[PDB]
Write an enzyme that holds these catalytic residues in place. Structure first.
Site, PDB file in Angstrom:
ATOM      1  N   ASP A 279      33.162  44.525  40.019  1.00 42.73           N
ATOM      2  CA  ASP A 279      33.286  43.293  40.799  1.00 42.73           C
ATOM      3  C   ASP A 279      32.112  42.805  41.679  1.00 42.73           C
ATOM      4  OD1 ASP A 279      36.286  44.687  42.189  1.00 42.73           O
ATOM      5  OD2 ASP A 279      34.332  44.424  43.179  1.00 42.73           O
TER       6      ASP A 279
ATOM      7  N   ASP B 159      43.804  50.319  48.047  1.00 39.93           N
ATOM      8  CA  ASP B 159      44.603  50.495  46.838  1.00 39.93           C
ATOM      9  C   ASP B 159      44.164  51.699  45.993  1.00 39.93           C
ATOM     10  OD1 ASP B 159      43.216  47.438  45.270  1.00 39.93           O
ATOM     11  OD2 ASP B 159      42.203  49.118  46.187  1.00 39.93           O
TER      12      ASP B 159
END
Length: 753
Positions: free
Chosen positions: A456, A32
């Site tokens: 993350d 992405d």
């Protein structure tokens, strides 16, 4: 210069996986934010093919191009490769197609007439660019905002196909475009909308909705929205992806939202173009032939459906979306009449969610990915995977790949599932670095040359660059937004971040910790700094002592950075400075002295941050610039300030006096800047820059050994990686820099080969 990863391996969302229909081993992955990768079967390694891209080019006017919206292959010519590139419908001023005649070794670039969204909602959805197999100069592209577009000049120029009505949710668009390989002029395109399956038999001249398609939710779905108490978000199934088996059968996954998060419901159907038959094929539904048996609990929302890959005979594989717990891949030899649940099959006895064994959480050669455990390292079990958007049966083997929000899992033999046994798995992320890094710190001594902070995954002490490491623990961070060491106490570092999983019964600030043993262990600051946002740790600086911490929260509050000389028992706001910033650095040699560059002004504290005084004569002197202080590892009161877009400035008297480096205020345009060991002992430290260093040198990675008189190029035109957003030199090795990027992890760069 030798350029090599500082290994993490994967670490982000795999948004698609495409195999050639004729050429064995010809496989690509799209990410992405992180460009595309070409599989190398021989070296057993994913190869980054888009590293030439610069995001937001400092020259003129660029965009976020690194993200790959779509991959398309020419079924009659394996040498061809087309990419649709561009991250954001909202934020990007343009996007682009990449065309290659040599499997992505080289590209030509053509401006897209429509914006793209590789990093938007529905990227988990499912091939927008497609080559017409019956006329390979012609390509279609299912745009996010402006319907179906057509090129007949190999993706060079483009026109809108107005003949396809586009009612799709604006910004998701036509998610999935497929050509019928068997019937010339037949094609299916999936609009993200109720009754969104469209067909042409005219080669795209005329379009109509496929007759018979579900326009409302099945009774099974309705029964669970009623049992669970939680409402569906659409009045009918919404297409995510479509594909034609070689059996002729059309498969479609639906959800009630575009994904990749936020879906609650969904279905899988098949359609038979030969007789108009629809079958409800959803593997977890009550009724049809799934082993092991579906949990069948109607009290919880089931989530929806994403991935499709088709194989030989009537083989098809599909994957859930947001079933988080039941998240799984399913195998049918049946066109969907019956299934094996790969997730359950592999789940060790006595695990709640579908899981992989922790001992299986490793590359094929056996190297582990310790960080994939997150806060549960040693539990024996990891998640089977989430955001199972991208799945792939190798058309030339028995392999099955599935992507997650973090890695690719693979098996060399999916057919074990036929005898009701779990395929054998491993992680297949060799070569992929998709992390978005936030901070790099190289302390002047200790067991490691690099500590990292990132989105993350938190970050890691990089003991060994060639191999993945475990992320920070106790506390475990989701992000580590700030990190620093002590200049003369290298065993002390501080860590600041988002903590999604606080350790049970451990007192103190979950969002903040400090070490005295080089991160062998950490302990929480006794209290949090005021104004701390839950989603972002802010910026810490550690005085050369190791005894003073300056802690700037990530939002303004009308105070300046808070100080502590009692390990977080107290945090005291300063005099002189009443603004919060990222632009903080501690002196590495004199204790209790910190430098601050915020909205154009420069401040120094010599009392541990209790009070600052505005200094910095010689710095650019009127507007409210942003910038980064960087302190010498070797001398007290020696520092630089890199002013973003304007210049780099050098002081040897604790910031009373700053001297512009050459080209400062004209050709010199730094994005990120750092210091490392000098070429000859105790000469001036070597500088590193990502940016434009002079009038005749382009944007790239540069180093200087004469305080900016001369900048030598370290990377090249094929090694930009999107551009660096983080950078650290190394105080113990001359000519070494670490660059972090937003979606390409960490590169280690070393002057000579």
């Amino acid at each position: 210069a030798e350029l090599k990863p500082v290994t993490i391996s994967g670490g982000g969302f795999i948004s698609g996986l495409v195999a050639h229909p004729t050429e064995k081993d010809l496989i690509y992955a799209r990410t992405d934010i992180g460009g595309t990768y070409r599989w190398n079967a021989a070296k057993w390694e994913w190869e980054p093919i888009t590293d030439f891209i610069i995001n937001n080019a400092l020259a003129g006017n660029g965009a976020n191009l690194l993200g790959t919206e779509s991959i398309a292959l020419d079924p009659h010519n394996p040498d061809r490769l087309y990419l649709a590139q561009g991250d954001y419908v909202q934020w990007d001023p343009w996007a682009a197609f990449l065309v290659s005649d040599d499997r992505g070794k080289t590209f030509k670039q053509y401006r897209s007439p429509v914006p793209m969204g590789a990093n938007d909602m529905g990227r988990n959805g499912g091939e927008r660019l497609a080559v017409n197999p019956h006329w390979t100069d012609e390509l279609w592209f299912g745009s996010r905002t402006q319907g179906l577009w057509r090129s007949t000049d190999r993706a060079q120029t483009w026109s809108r196909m107005n003949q396809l009505p586009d009612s799709s949710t604006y910004g998701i668009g036509i998610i999935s475009v497929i050509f019928d390989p068997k019937n010339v002029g037949t094609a299916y395109v999936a609009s993200h909308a109720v009754g969104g399956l469209w067909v042409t038999w005219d080669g795209g001249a005329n379009w109509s909705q496929v007759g018979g398609q579900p326009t409302q939710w099945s009774d099974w779905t309705k029964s669970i929205v009623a049992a669970s108490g939680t409402a569906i978000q659409s009045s009918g199934p919404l297409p995510i992806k479509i594909a034609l088996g070689k059996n002729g059968r059309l498969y479609i996954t639906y959800s009630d939202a575009p994904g990749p998060w936020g879906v609650l419901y969904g279905e899988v159907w098949s359609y038979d173009p030969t007789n108009g038959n629809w079958k409800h094929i959803t593997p977890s539904r009550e009724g049809a032939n799934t082993y092991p048996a579906p949990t069948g609990n109607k009290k919880v929302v089931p989530g929806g459906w994403n991935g499709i890959s088709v194989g030989n005979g009537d083989t098809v594989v599909v994957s859930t979306l947001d079933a988080n717990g039941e998240d799984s891949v399913y195998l049918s030899r049946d066109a969907g009449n019956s299934w094996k649940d790969l997730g359950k099959l592999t789940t060790p006895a006595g695990a709640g969610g579908n899981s992989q064994k922790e001992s299986d959480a490793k590359l094929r050669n056996g190297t582990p990915l310790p960080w994939l455990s997150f806060q549960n390292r040693g539990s024996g079990i990891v998640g089977f995977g989430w955001w199972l958007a991208a799945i792939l049966l190798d058309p030339f083997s028995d392999r099955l790949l599935y992507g997650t929000g973090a890695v690719i899992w693979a098996t060399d033999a999916v057919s074990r599932a036929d005898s009701n046994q779990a395929p054998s798995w491993y992680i297949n992320t060799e070569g992929i670095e998709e992390t978005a890094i936030l901070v790099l710190k190289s302390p002047p001594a200790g067991p490691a040359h690099l500590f990292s902070g990132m989105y993350d995954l938190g970050g890691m002490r990089h003991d060994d660059f060639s191999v993945p490491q475990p992320m920070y623990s106790k506390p475990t961070f989701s992000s580590t937004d700030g990190l620093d060491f002590a200049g003369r106490a290298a065993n002390v570092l501080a860590r600041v971040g988002r903590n999604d999983h606080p350790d049970a019964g451990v007192a103190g600030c979950t969002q903040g910790a400090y070490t005295t043993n080089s991160g062998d262990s950490w302990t929480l600051f006794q209290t949090c700094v005021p104004s701390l946002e839950v989603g972002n740790g802010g910026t810490i600086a550690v005085g050369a002592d190791g005894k003073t911490f300056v802690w700037s929260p990530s939002k303004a509050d009308g105070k300046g950075p808070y100080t502590s000389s009692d390990y977080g028992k107290t945090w005291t706001a300063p005099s002189g400075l009443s603004k919060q910033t990222t632009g903080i650095a501690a002196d590495r040699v004199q204790a209790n002295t910190f430098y601050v560059y915020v909205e154009g002004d420069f401040f120094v504290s010599t009392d541990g941050g209790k009070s600052y005084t505005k200094k910095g004569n010689g710095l650019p002197c009127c507007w409210t610039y942003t910038g980064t202080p960087v302190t010498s590892n070797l001398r007290a009161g020696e520092l630089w300030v890199s002013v973003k877009g304007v210049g780099i400035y050098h002081s040897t008297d604790f910031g009373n006096t700053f001297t512009a480096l050459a080209g400062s205020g004209s050709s010199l345009n730094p994005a990120v800047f750092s210091i490392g060991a000098p070429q000859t002992p105790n000469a001036t430290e070597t500088l590193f820059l990502w940016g434009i260093p002079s009038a005749s040198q382009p944007e790239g990675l540069y180093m200087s050994t004469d305080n900016g008189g001369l900048w030598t190029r370290l990377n090249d035109d094929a090694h930009n990686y999107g551009g660096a957003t983080v950078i650290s030199g190394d105080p113990r090795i001359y000519g070494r820099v670490y660059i972090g990027m937003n979606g390409r992890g960490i590169i280690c760069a070393q002057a000579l080969g």
